Each structure stands twice: as C-alpha cells, then as structure tokens.
Amino acid sequence: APILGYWKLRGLGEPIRLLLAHTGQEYEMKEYSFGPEPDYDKSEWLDEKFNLGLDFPNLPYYIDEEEGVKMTQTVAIIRYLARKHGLVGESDEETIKIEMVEQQAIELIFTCTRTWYCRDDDLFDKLKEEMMTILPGKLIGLAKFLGENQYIIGDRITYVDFMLYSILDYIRLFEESLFDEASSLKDYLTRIESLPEIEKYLSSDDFKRFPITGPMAKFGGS
Amino acid sequence: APILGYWKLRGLGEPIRLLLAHTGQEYEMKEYSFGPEPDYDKSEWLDEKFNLGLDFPNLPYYIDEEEGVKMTQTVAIIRYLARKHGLVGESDEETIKIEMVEQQAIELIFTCTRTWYCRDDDLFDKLKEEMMTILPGKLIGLAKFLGENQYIIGDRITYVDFMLYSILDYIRLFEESLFDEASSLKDYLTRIESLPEIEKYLSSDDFKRFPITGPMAKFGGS
Ligand SMILES: N[C@@H](CCC(=O)N[C@@H](CS)C(=O)NCC(=O)O)C(=O)O
C-alpha cells in the first residue's frame, strides 16, 4: 500500500493529504522530524534521502511499489493522484482554469516562504510589510475568480481546491486582516472544511494547525 | 492571430516562445518595458493590465480570441500549448516523468531568482555561495534523469525540454563552471539549439542572450 513521505509540518504535504482524505485512498504516512534546539538538523531525512531510488530526492515523496510509482514533486504528486481519482478537468476549458488557479496558489507559496524563512529581523519585518501591501490584490483576484461558484471550477471539487485551501489557511493564520475585503474566500474555506473526510481529517488528534513551516522559520514554527 | 504578452526579457516567456517556434504556430508578440533607472515603473503594463479580461492579470499572458482563450500563468499557458501540439506525455509513466522535470525546472527558477534579485550585497553573496553549493546536486539529478536519452522523455521532445533549455541556459551564462563536469547536459542544450526552428529563433536579430532578468536584478539586467 502506497507511502507518502514528508516532514512533521503541514507545509507542502497537507494538500496531498487533503486529497487522499477526500478520495478515501489508503496510504501509510512516513514523517521526518528535525533535530533539537537550536539545530533542527534534517539528518533523519538525509540518512535515507538518496537511498529510496528517487529521481529527484526531495520531500514530499510518494511511493507505490504496488503500482511501480516513485515520485518527488508536490504538484507532480498531486496531479498524478488527481488523475487517478478524476479530480482533474473534464474539458480543456476546465483544465485551463484549474491550472491557472494551481499556479496562482504556488505563487503565494513562493512569496510567503521567501518571507517566513528570512531570519534577519530587520529583513523579515521588511518583507512582511511588503507582503501586506501585495496580497490584498491577490486575494481579491481569487475572490473575483470564485465569485458565486461553490468550488474553484464551480460545482465539482478539483485538486486545486485542496492546494488553495492550505495556502489560504496559512495566510489566514498569518494575517486575517488581508481577507477583510475578500470575505467570499472565508466562506469557501468553511465549505471545504465541512466536506466529510476533510472534517474528519481536521478533527483528528493527528491534525494540529501548527506547525505550518519548519522550526527554522520565523512564522508557523512551533 | 493569438497574442503572447510578457516583458522585453527572456525570463519566464522564452520557453513558450521556444515552443511556439518549434511548432511553427503563428503568434503576435506584445512586449512591455520598464521605467528607466533607478525607477523601473511598470506603468506601461499597468495601463493595459485590467483591460484584457484576464482572470489573474499578470505577465506573461496568452490571448486567442479565435479559440476563446485568455490565460495568464506561465505553466498553465505552456501546458495549454503543449496539449494543442501534443508535446505532452502519451502515457501516465511519461506524464509522471514530464511533470517531475517540469517542477524541477521551476524549482531552479526559484532558487536562482531569490539570488539574482537580492540587492543586499552581503546577502546576495551569501545566497550565491548557497546556490553554488546546491545547484551541482540539481544538475547531477537531471544528468542522471536524462542519461543517454536524446530528450527528457526519449527521442520525442516535450514542452519540458523548452522549459529546461532556458533555465539551464540562464544558469550556464551565470556560471559555466557548474557544467564543467556536465557534458551530458551541454550536449542536451546543443541538441535543442540545433533543432531547425530553434536555431532560426536563436539566430534571429530579435534574439539577444541578455537580458534574462529585469533591470532591477543584480544578475542578467542587460
Ligand atoms: N528557506 C527556503 C525554502 C525552505 C523550505 O521550504 N524548506 C524546508 C521546509 S519544506 C525543508 O525542510 N526542506 C527540506 C526538504 O523538504 O527537502 C527559501 O525560502 O528559500
């Protein structure tokens, strides 16, 4: 039965975990923990890193010996699973919209990570204020995109709803004020949370909202 | 005829331009320039930005009134075009490989940008040494991935070969020493370059190796 490897944190793994949950697909979850203060070494990962026959050894990874699958890119992984459970577009019109939103989600992750991982206080704060001034536009764009739709593509839930859920949730837990002029999105997150297996997943003891990022990062650390 | 919008740099647009070239698809290219130093305003873009009915107005964009398409995300755009010209995987095995490489290409784009755009001299230098420590592994992974194959998948060119061409070229023009022990990849670039339409594109008077990045970037400005 298939394996999903990633850190103890939510980070890039959550949206895959979310999709596995929704589709009720059985998986074993292999987690890696960091070292203690103030090292937090990745040695537990690095010991096994190059010895799993991964083309591009990285976290997360997904391994299905049973299906002869051994992958390592978060998007690649989620698109693979999306294909298997038909959580992809049924038309190129759909596909275009899905993939725009996909990339839109990733772009947020870039901006956020670039900031949450900067350690220089004088720099962290600088980027934080720069983020505050940029994201509102981003969130409005998504609000406009979604509009009266239930999910990103309308009525049907696609893998991008999982992607989007997490990055928006992370932003929510970071500065809700950014959602002040984009309420529609909060409703959307709730809509997702109300989903049966996502509600189970989120109400599990295994679920904790923190941490989002590594203990090394300023935000979402502990 | 369809329109491709982007800045007057290679940046994220080139791999799409490359693919359009190879497939001999007719397109009009709409280009945007920044303000002079030390300003670089985006006003030329911002004038037209919200007037094209783009869901996520951003550069690059692709518009084909003929087809009813108006997209804005680089990967989304290239995957759309890949689908139209069948430069995509024809098996899940193929697809999986393509999409891992795709993400691997983007991951380089990230690692390179955070460095080439960092104005802080001290920080720039730090990130540069960090790159020089990290990229070798990256390039070995790709070397191993490609092996004796002609193109990433085999004898068949996929859109990822274009993606990869550009980011590898950018890295080459940054530090050839990184490819000192990487003949396999150098051979790969040569192969892509020696495709007829790509040779035509690269030998055009419209083609200059620089600029790669924006004026504001430390590396690749013009
Ligand atoms: N600090 C980097 C990215 C940091 C990052 O996301 N890496 C962490 C959290 S997933 C990690 O533990 N990387 C090890 C791995 O997953 O290979 C940046 O912002 O440029």
Which residue segments constitute the domains of chain B, with CATH numbers given?
A: 3-85 (1.20.1050.130), 92-195 (1.20.1050.10)
A112 CA to centre of ligand 1 in angstroms: 12
Q: How far is CA A55 from the centre of its chain?
A: 22
In angstroms, what CA-CA distances link A134 with A120, A130, A193, B119, B180?
A: 21, 6, 27, 20, 41
Nearest CA to ligand 1 atom 12: A214
Phi and psi at residue A47, in whole multiples of 5°?
-65, -35
Query: Where do the DSSP E strands lie in chain A?
Result: 3-7, 28-32, 61-64, 69-71
Residue labelled with tokens 């970037």? B217
Which residues are paired to A55 by β-bridges? Answer: none
Which residue on chain B is closest to A114 by alpha carbon? B114
In angstroms, what CA-CA distances link B28 with A50, A73, A86, B20, B159?
A: 46, 34, 36, 11, 20
User: Minimal Cα–Cα distance from A203 to chain B, Å?
Assistant: 32
- Ligand 1 site, residue A209, Cβ cutoff 6 A: no
Residue B6 counted as an annotated binding residue: yes
Q: How many CB pairs under 8 A join A and B?
A: 76
Test A103 with B71 for CB contact under 8 angstroms.
no
How far is Cα A31 from Cα A191, in angstroms, rounded to an integer?
29
Which residue on chain B is closest to A107 by alpha carbon? B73
Is residue B146 within 8 A of residue B184, CB to CB? The reply is yes
A214 CA to centre of ligand 1 in angstroms: 8
In angstroms, what CA-CA distances link A123 with A110, A133, B114?
A: 16, 16, 14
